[PDB]
């Protein structure tokens, strides 16, 4: 009943940008000071994974 559109989830971009900028520094402690790290989306396989 009513209009249809896909289900979705909203995450504020400023908070997520800050959270990534805070996790990247904790990750550099194990993988190098003044180095670059990347993260793309999932590889593939199970839908639940």
């Amino acid at each position: 009943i009513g209009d249809i559109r896909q289900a979705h989830c909203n995450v504020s971009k400023a908070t997520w940008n800050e959270t990534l900028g805070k996790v990247v520094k904790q990750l550099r402690k194990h993988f190098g000071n003044n180095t670059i790290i990347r993260f793309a989306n999932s590889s593939g396989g199970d839908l639940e994974v």
Partner: antibody, heavy 130, light 109 residues
Framework: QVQLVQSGAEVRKPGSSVTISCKPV????????IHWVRQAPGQGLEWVGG????????KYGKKFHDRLRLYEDDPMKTVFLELRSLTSDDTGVYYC???????????????????????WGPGTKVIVSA | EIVLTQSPVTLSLSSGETGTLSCRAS???????IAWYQQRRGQVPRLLIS???ARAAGIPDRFTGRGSGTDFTLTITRLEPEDFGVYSC?????????FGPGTQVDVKR
Amino acid sequence: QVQLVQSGAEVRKPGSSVTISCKPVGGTFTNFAIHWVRQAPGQGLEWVGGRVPVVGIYKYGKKFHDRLRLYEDDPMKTVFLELRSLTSDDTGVYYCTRWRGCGMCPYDTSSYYNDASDVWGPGTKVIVSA
Amino acid sequence: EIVLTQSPVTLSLSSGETGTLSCRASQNISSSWIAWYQQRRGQVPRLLISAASARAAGIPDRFTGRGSGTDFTLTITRLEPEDFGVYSCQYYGGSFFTFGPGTQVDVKR
């Protein structure tokens, strides 16, 4: 781009009731509100009522209480106007009006009612004459 | 209630001539609840300007809208024989919409 398609003209006896359909084509159904603007033959435009289709946000004119009833039918995606106790004053052309906006933005689940009307139905000529 | 009035009942204009229609409100209203409509020869009304200044989709440059508080004006710098007919102003703010009585324009002669 959206479009409004109404019913054909009708003739009703005084004191009876009339029901007019209006089906939008190619647009969001539950967002913007459907207002009804009528024009008595030779006079200015008169606002009848307005109603968000499914949400129910509606309000009729002061002149049309105990005679007007706006409803809809989402299986057919068509709104309806019902006017009772017809007099020769109620003769005229009834318009189905609506606002259209953005179109690309789909995540808007809200309901709007205080808007103008750029999308107009061709009109439905209601003639009250016994 | 909120009722609107239109002053220049019949406004005569030739080609290139400039006119100014008025729409006075009873109370003080916001400058975001006034629209202007064009109605040519008993056909479908076309929304000219929303929010008393926002020119609608495809409406030409010849239609400029102004107004604040009580009086709202619609200025037509130039006009073709295309845009002739009855102009109406609508208050679309509160829970009760109300239109202006209409104002017809003539080919000045």
